[PDB]
């Protein structure tokens, strides 16, 4: 049991190191496969685009202190280091909305109280490093044993729903700013419809090529090779399609040029821990502990839940995972980066899931039978390193990246969001709310429990998810991780009383 | 055996009358079903739109002698009479391209001969009536027993392919006349993309609602009721969507106003056989026999092949079909109508198939089983009569019909064309050309015949179909029926020599 209290200092870290490191040379040898290259190509864009979007947003919110170049450098460096020395290379680390909310709140607080914005973050990082070291020393990462399925399912469903909603909402603004009237360009004709056509075409091509993979046409080898290259093929096809058109205007991908800070007139690479232009008050030296706890809670919750989700026994992960080394590495890297004015990073989730399930191999299921069961996942240390390296050097190139419209990427994002719902018991039980009781499948949680009890369980889960979404939307969005943690006591106290033992084992089974 | 030489004069007609008429009151009592109303709504537009398009084309080709109003009246009257007294009410009577080609050729011939056009189309009708009576008297309709599957499959596939190609080509002209530039309408912005969006949306909504019918969601009754109303729902949804948009211009459905001739200044309802402005030469009175034979061959071939296709034993038609009464009625109506200047009509293959397979009922199948087998077809005499009556009076209304864009109808036409390919062995054997030999299904023409022989048979069929299409495209398009008839001797002579008896029985099975 990896999540066992050894009883000795740094015991969990040492156990993880001995468990994972022996299979080191095998990690790099398992990269000889076309699926690896397809995964690299697919994940490069998924990692790059959010970096640019969030960098633009962060630059807009702050007074041009953190922009896009800093975010790109931070992502590249942290990803490279984590994939070189991490224990779970199937994790993609990048900005997250909660981080943006916290950064904006901290900037507002500093402006209100007349304090430097890039000086407090250094002390926040110092406190974060100290807290991570203290927690790893005491083996406090064993508490993940109490994060059951009732929380992982809610987290995954909420993340996927938010992803889909954001992708859909990014397209309404194009119609709002380019209305259909007829007679930084604004008010252009033939733009809002061309964007929609491009996005729909990309999505449908990707979906069709995914379906063709499991079909009975063509030889098996060629069919599988083409099926695993669907996303690049769709991207290439519609990029060419929009390139053919000449007079219409579409928004392109914008990547800054030059490895330099956004505002060199008032910034530098190295930030003095003390005041840079005026003395830093001492009272803030020790008062920085409070935001450090919040940042640590956010990062820990996100990373641990993502690692739990991508390590389910249904998925065939053979080399093993580690909950101690990964957290230490991520928190230390985040704390150290603040000394250079770079933002913090954490495991993505949707990107991590799309990366993990893009390397899976499905076994033949004969003519009849259920959906083919997972055979292997093919983990290695080459894909993530390559993705991070490519994202880091996306500045030297960028003339080619300027010929790619954003509407094409919106379809890929929608395809990523829709396919991430597969493998969640909550989603599968949501279908049963519409099917008649005689058509329910032969799963364990169907024969051993009554239909009404399962429906009540699903309704309670939906209520919790709706409450979490409502909390996130409200201005008090910094308390989301705290509200998420409350699900564990809920399951431990209320659900045990409401439901019987057999029902709880059947619905909330570990495997 | 319906196709048996009775010997007695007019024996086939009498046999058909006694076989079909007894089940008369049942035809009108089987119309109490929501599926009947759904079929009526679906088929109304499919019948109306081609009438308008072909009427416009005919008016353009001739000097405004036959237009749209005459075609509408002819369709309505002939449909009503045929459905009231016909033996196979599952047939839809409407113009056909070959008829347009023949009409244009006849007009061109009469133009450079100093001869009338409408006067010359009365003797053709007289000769057609005489020929139909002579053939029915001698029981010459028994020859349809030599038309095997090798010809029906080719005919059906060619008709469906031409339908799909025409529907797709109707959309390229919109882009050609409304190019994307940006700055009797012409050169408008946002018009070529809105039409594409509307067509795609209509098609996809119809397809999704069709798939939802066979799913496991919702109660069976509600699911089936919603599934059989997919086309009207799609039409309504996008008509509303297009109506919401204000200033963008789209082409609407246009129908003439008033029950009057297109060119009253130089035409009338009744045409004098002797002449209208100048005496009609006698030499042409007896020379009209030649075009009469060609028209008779066209109508006979089309109607007989359509009746054969819709009467396959795979489909469950229990009330019986008639090959003599139907042909007699159709030819007599076509000949008589020419006396009033109205065009001839014939059964429509695609419309007839879509009508027949829109009234079918599917039985419940096994979860790990094949597609459900057909249970019944639910034939009656109310749907076709209602469709003809509605098309006839589509002139009093038309303010409502002017709010329906054509791009919406293009999607319905594409859906009709794609779904018509189901049930053809030639189409099913085309998939096998791509599947590996180990995945071929468990059918009789797979186990009893070596794969290469079946592929050779499919290749020969494809060669014949390509030759027929090439002949149709070429200017010498009036010889298409003659080329089609040559397939029967080909099958009787060459295929028998090339292939063995055992292979021929399996590949060319009657049932």
From Swiss-Prot, chains A, B:
Species annotation: Homo sapiens
Could you tell me what this protein does? Sodium-independent anion exchanger which mediates the electroneutral exchange of chloride for bicarbonate ions across the cell membrane. Plays an important role in osteoclast differentiation and function. Regulates bone resorption and calpain-dependent actin cytoskeleton organization in osteoclasts via anion exchange-dependent control of pH. Essential for intracellular pH regulation in CD8(+) T-cells upon CD3 stimulation, modulating CD8(+) T-cell responses.
**Protein name per Swiss-Prot or TrEMBL:** Anion exchange protein 2
**Can you list the disulfide-bonded cysteine pairs?**
none
The UniProt similarity line reads: Belongs to the anion exchanger (TC 2.A.31) family.
Q: Which residues cross the membrane?
A: 36-59, 65-102, 112-144, 154-175, 192-209, 225-245, 279-301, 327-350, 382-427, 454-490
Give the source lineage, highest ranks first: Eukaryota, Metazoa, Chordata, Craniata, Vertebrata
Lipid-bearing positions (S-palmitoyl cysteine): 464
Q: Membrane side Cytoplasmic: which residues?
A: 210-224
Disorder association = Osteopetrosis, autosomal recessive 9: A form of osteopetrosis, a rare genetic disease characterized by abnormally dense bone, due to defective resorption of immature bone. Osteopetrosis occurs in two forms: a severe autosomal recessive form occurring in utero, infancy, or childhood, and a benign autosomal dominant form occurring in adolescence or adulthood. Recessive osteopetrosis commonly manifests in early infancy with macrocephaly, feeding difficulties, evolving blindness and deafness, bone marrow failure, severe anemia, and hepatosplenomegaly.
Q: Where is this region: Membrane (anion exchange)?
A: 36-511
